[PDB]
Amino acid sequence: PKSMQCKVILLDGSEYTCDVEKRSRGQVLFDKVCEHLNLLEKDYFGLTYRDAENQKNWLDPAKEIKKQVRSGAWHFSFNVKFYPPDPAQLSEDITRYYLCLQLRDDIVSGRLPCSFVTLALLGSYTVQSELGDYDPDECGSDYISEFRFAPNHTKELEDKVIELHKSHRGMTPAEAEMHFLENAKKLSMYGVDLHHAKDSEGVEIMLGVCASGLLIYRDRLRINRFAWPKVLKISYKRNNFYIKIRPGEFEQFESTIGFKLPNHRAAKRLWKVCVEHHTFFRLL
Numbered sequence: 001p002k003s004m005q006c007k008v009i010l011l012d013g014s015e016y017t018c019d020v021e022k023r024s025r026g027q028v029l030f031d032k033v034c035e036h037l038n039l040l041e042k043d044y045f046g047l048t049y050r051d052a053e054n055q056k057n058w059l060d061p062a063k064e065i066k067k068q069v070r071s072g073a074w075h076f077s078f079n080v081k082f083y084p085p086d087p088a089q090l091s092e093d094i095t096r097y098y099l100c101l102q103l104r105d106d107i108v109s110g111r112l113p114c115s116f117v118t119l120a121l122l123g124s125y126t127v128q129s130e131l132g133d134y135d136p137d138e139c140g141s142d143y144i145s146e147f148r149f150a151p152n153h154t155k156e157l158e159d160k161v162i163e164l165h166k167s168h169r170g171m172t173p174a175e176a177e178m179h180f181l182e183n184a185k186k187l188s189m190y191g192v193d194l195h196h197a198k199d200s201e202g203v204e205i206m207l208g209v210c211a212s213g214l215l216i217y218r219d220r221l222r223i224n225r226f227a228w229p230k231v232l233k234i235s236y237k238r239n240n241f242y243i244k245i246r247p248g249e250f251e252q253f254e255s256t257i258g259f260k261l262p263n264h265r266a267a268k269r270l271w272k273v274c275v276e277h278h279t280f281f282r283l284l
């Protein structure tokens with residue numbers, strides 16, 4: 001029985017290596033990684049890989065790994081797929097822990113924009129969780145944390161992390177992680193998967209996919225939002241992505257909004273993440 005070596009980048013930046021039979025479905029590898037992580041609430045997470053165009057793709061757990069990675073390396077990342085709107089409702093602290101690790105990368109990467117004060121507050125909760133109570137011995141006037149808190153670090157931001165860290169004395173790691181999540185969950189881009197697209201007139205927009213629905217970012221002044229219940233049908237054809245928008249009460253017909261994606265693979269990828277979010281957030 002021939003087995004392929006798999007390398008998975010974990011949310012703490014470490015590498016897990018395992019073997020699966022070469023005809024294995026994605027669920028087989030996912031179950032091995034989740035057992036390694038002692039993760040029971042697995043529904044929120046998945047594995048990503050990079051395709052021949054270097055785009056992030058979700059590994060479909062129901063399909064053969066080899067028919068997804070195709071010509072590429074069996075290299076993956078472990079990631080949050082469905083960001084819970086209310087992390088307090090997750091049953092386990094270790095679930096909230098991995099969600100925190102993912103969000104820390106969302107912030108450092110700039111996928112999750114954040115004000116100065118919120119960067120410092122989220123930072124302060126991580127430090128409390130990871131080091132425990134503030135100690136002056138470690139941090140002098142010139143202290144700079146090993147922890148990455150932001151896309152761009154300043155001495156002012158390091159100072160504000162320390163000031164808020166002092167306020168958290170006696171906070172336990174689970175408590176600090178829950179506070180981190182209570183703040184992060186409110187950010188306007190929390191759990192929003194962004195896709196570059198053009199509208200029917202050729203104007204460059206972004207489509208965001210999240211728990212609540214589909215967002216169309218146009219000007220900064222004019223963001224259209226479609227709650228999942230108002231979305232009747234999702235579809236793609238060639239480079240185009242289509243949504244069927246419900247008639248407003250006493251309207252005779254559904255409405256249709258069309259988008260141009262960069263290529264056919266980018267259109268299918270957006271279709272699949274929309275279908276999965278629609279299903280996931282219809283059952284929650």
Ligand SMILES: CN(CCc1ccccn1)C(=O)c1ccccc1
Nearest residue numbers: 210211212213214215225226227228
């Ligand atoms: C849940 N919220 C955030 C609060 C909000 C809602 C409406 C207007 C301003 N801010 C969304 O942006 C949203 C996403 C997709 C469909 C419907 C609403």
